[PDB]
Amino acid sequence: GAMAPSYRVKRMDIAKNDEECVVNAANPRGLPGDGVCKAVYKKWPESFKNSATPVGTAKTVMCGTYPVIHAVGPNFSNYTESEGDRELAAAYREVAKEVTRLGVNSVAIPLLSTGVYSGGKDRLTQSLNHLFTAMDSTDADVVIYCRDKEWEKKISEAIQMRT
Ligand SMILES: C[C@@H]1CN(C(=O)c2cnsn2)[C@@H](C)CO1
Ligand SMILES: [Cl-]
């Protein structure tokens, strides 16, 4: 575990993370995809061997000894708000199980079911709160990666307000 488990946020490419493992915002078919998924594919393509997994699940594949946790959030274009919410919370629960199993002291994590899976809605708060619900019982240092300047501020405020 980390001596004083923390949450942090950085605005940069998660492929340049300084953590012991990464969470990919994966598609269910293990395809290179776009956005975070494509950056992850470029950096750790070996981690896409048999990475396909259903919505609401996480599947870890090693790139060397570096664990890539492929977490499949729902595409809110396809799911109802109710069913998508349930699957999004489930994907993060599976990430917490994998982070725990791996014994890492840190993890780099993107906000699942944002961007191309958001169904054109702002899901920062929904996705971040499911992240916290799953990760709060873990003792890994969590570093959230984002790309938007306004999202960085909102995530940073949400972290700071619970300390
Ligand atoms: C891709 C990231 C996250 N994001 C969203 O998910 C989104 C989608 N519809 S409203 N907001 C926007 C802030 C753009 O930057
Ligand atoms: Cl960058």
Side-chain angles (χ1 to χ4, degrees), residues 1-115:
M3 278 303 112
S6 64
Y7 289 107
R8 298 170 50 232
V9 57
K10 297 204 295 175
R11 184 180 82 102
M12 55 181 281
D13 183 357
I14 199 168
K16 299 170 180 190
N17 78 73
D18 191 30
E19 290 68 59
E20 294 184 355
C21 68
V22 71
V23 174
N24 185 28
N27 59 73
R29 300 179 182 277
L31 291 161
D34 313 276
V36 159
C37 192
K38 177 49 75 58
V40 166
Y41 182 69
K42 289 174 177 170
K43 183 56 68 176
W44 302 287
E46 300 87 345
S47 70
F48 288 71
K49 194 175 189 277
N50 291 310
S51 62
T53 198
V55 172
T57 76
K59 182 167 191 183
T60 301
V61 182
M62 310 299 296
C63 174
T65 70
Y66 188 77
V68 179
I69 304 171
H70 299 271
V72 185
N75 177 3
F76 275 98
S77 290
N78 299 334
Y79 283 88
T80 65
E81 288 294 329
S82 175
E83 274 299 282
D85 185 69
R86 181 180 62 65
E87 287 298 1
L88 175 57
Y92 282 115
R93 292 189 300 275
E94 304 297 306
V95 165
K97 294 179 191 173
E98 285 296 279
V99 165
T100 298
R101 184 185 62 78
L102 285 164
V104 295
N105 293 333
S106 66
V107 51
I109 190 161
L111 294 185
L112 302 177
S113 293
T114 61

Side-chain angles (χ1 to χ4, degrees), residues 107-144:
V107 51
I109 190 161
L111 294 185
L112 302 177
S113 293
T114 61
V116 296
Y117 279 13
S118 67
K121 284 191 189 153
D122 178 346
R123 300 185 185 274
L124 190 168
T125 297
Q126 172 181 27
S127 186
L128 180 60
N129 283 338
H130 285 321
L131 189 161
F132 290 150
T133 296
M135 301 305 295
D136 277 348
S137 65
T138 75
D139 64 0
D141 280 337
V142 171
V143 181
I144 300 165

